[PDB]
Design a protein around this ligand. Structure first.
Ligand SMILES: [Os+3]
Ligand SMILES: [Os+3]
Lengths: 181, 181
């Protein structure tokens, strides 16, 4: 995670969640094994002791379940972070590329557009992505999402303003205006 | 979901979440499209109206995000339900199969055990599965999990009692006792 090179991320990301899982079960089952033995003694001990063993290990697992939590979030935040940089970086590019329009003999009307749908579908990936991500916050931590709606509302609005502000660049190139539209 | 036959479930399950996703984005983007147009009018209207349009669609999306929620849970509960029946059904079987031991000439010491690890690893799938499932409740709806810990604690305990109570059937067959152990 702190190094990784194989381009495709879902690959890696999947692999990290994967081994994150092959790791917890390991430490977790060790407790379900330390617990079983544990009770195997409070078997002929007071019922008060039986009870404390239960409450002790009942807490060790919460401990672990917590570690893993954090541990897992730490993974996600990265992905998201890595995902967004891709998404922004691509977008920015298609801008110049779609900016490179298709100026020459017949302004490659098929390229302009070919290029356009890149920007568009791209910028949609943003919107589509910004949204998914949020739903998560809506569920998992309803309060967390409350705070962050004002924040993310602004974002979506930016894309909208941008997108149209992009299409509105045809208001600088008349030929392909009615031509492509 | 109400019919399905292709054995493997993860397959289907994946497919259902899949189309559940190809469906929401559809209805969702329609709102992000009904919203954009909407604001495009409150553009020269009072700032009070601009504000209501915002608050109206801000609520239509919560609506949808809610539908989808429910809609998605409805999927999960099935899977879990289908998953558990597999898990129980298999287990029960390995019991008789592992019960079928390996009685004959040399009580297929390699079969008894071969059979055993089926039961075991099986019953672990239970424990492993019961646990995963719960972590979900711990996160998503912390309160939900609080209620249900007493319930699921009992379960895990049952497997434990069972498992050992199974191995302890060798206390009925002496040959393979020291023989396999
Ligand atoms: Os995400
Ligand atoms: Os599950």
């Amino acid at each position: 995670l702190e190094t990784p090179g194989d381009e495709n991320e879902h690959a890696h990301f999947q692999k990290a969640k994967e081994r994150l899982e092959a790791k917890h079960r390991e430490r977790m089952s060790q407790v379900m094994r330390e617990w079983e033995e544990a009770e195997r003694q409070a078997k002929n001990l007071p019922k008060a002791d039986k009870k404390a063993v239960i409450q002790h290990f009942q807490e060790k697992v919460e401990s672990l379940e917590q570690e893993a939590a954090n541990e897992r979030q730490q993974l996600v935040e990265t992905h998201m972070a890595r995902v967004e940089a891709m998404l922004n970086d691509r977008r920015r590019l298609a801008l110049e590329n779609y900016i490179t329009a298709l100026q020459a003999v017949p302004p490659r009307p098929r390229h302009v557009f070919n290029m356009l749908k890149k920007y568009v579908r791209a910028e949609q990936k943003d919107r589509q992505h910004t949204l998914k991500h949020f739903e998560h916050v809506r569920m998992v931590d309803p309060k967390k999402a409350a705070q962050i709606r004002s924040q993310v509302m602004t974002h979506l609005r930016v894309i909208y303003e941008r997108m149209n502000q992009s299409l509105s660049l045809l208001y600088n190139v008349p030929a392909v205006a009615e031509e492509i539209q």
